[PDB]
């Protein structure tokens, strides 16, 4: 998509408007806050979807009741599904809540016999 006129427009002409063009995204030098705003799941998007986890299991819930409240496509909701949790609990429920326990009282210290 583009504007092609050159008959309506000749009588202001020029090439640059602002103080960027091409020595910023080429050359950044402040990673500290990234526009990472696109529907990311940020609070009350968690207090549906994982407020179903709690009451169904996993797959027993259906895409329209997630589509009707986060405001997704049905496909979405779908595939946000399997993509979020395929297994549930990233399959790692199989040795923890049966097998973790306290020996010296203390967790992430350096423990290298």
Same mark, same amino acid.
């Given at each position: ?21 091409? #020595? ?34 996993? #797959? ?22 399997? #993509? ?6 990233? #399959? ?22």
């Amino acid at each position: 998509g583009s504007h092609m006129a050159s008959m309506d427009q000749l009588d202001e002409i020029i090439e640059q408007i602002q103080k960027e063009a091409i #020595n910023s995204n080429v050359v950044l030098k402040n990673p500290r806050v990234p526009t990472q705003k696109t529907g990311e799941l940020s609070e009350e998007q968690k207090k549906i979807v994982a407020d179903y986890i709690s009451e169904v299991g996993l #797959n027993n819930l259906n895409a329209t009741e997630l589509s009707k409240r986060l405001n997704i496509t049905v496909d979405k909701a779908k595939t946000y599904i399997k #993509n979020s949790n395929r297994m549930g609990r990233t #399959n790692n429920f199989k040795t923890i809540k049966m097998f973790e326990d306290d020996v010296s009282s203390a967790s992430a210290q350096p423990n290298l016999p």
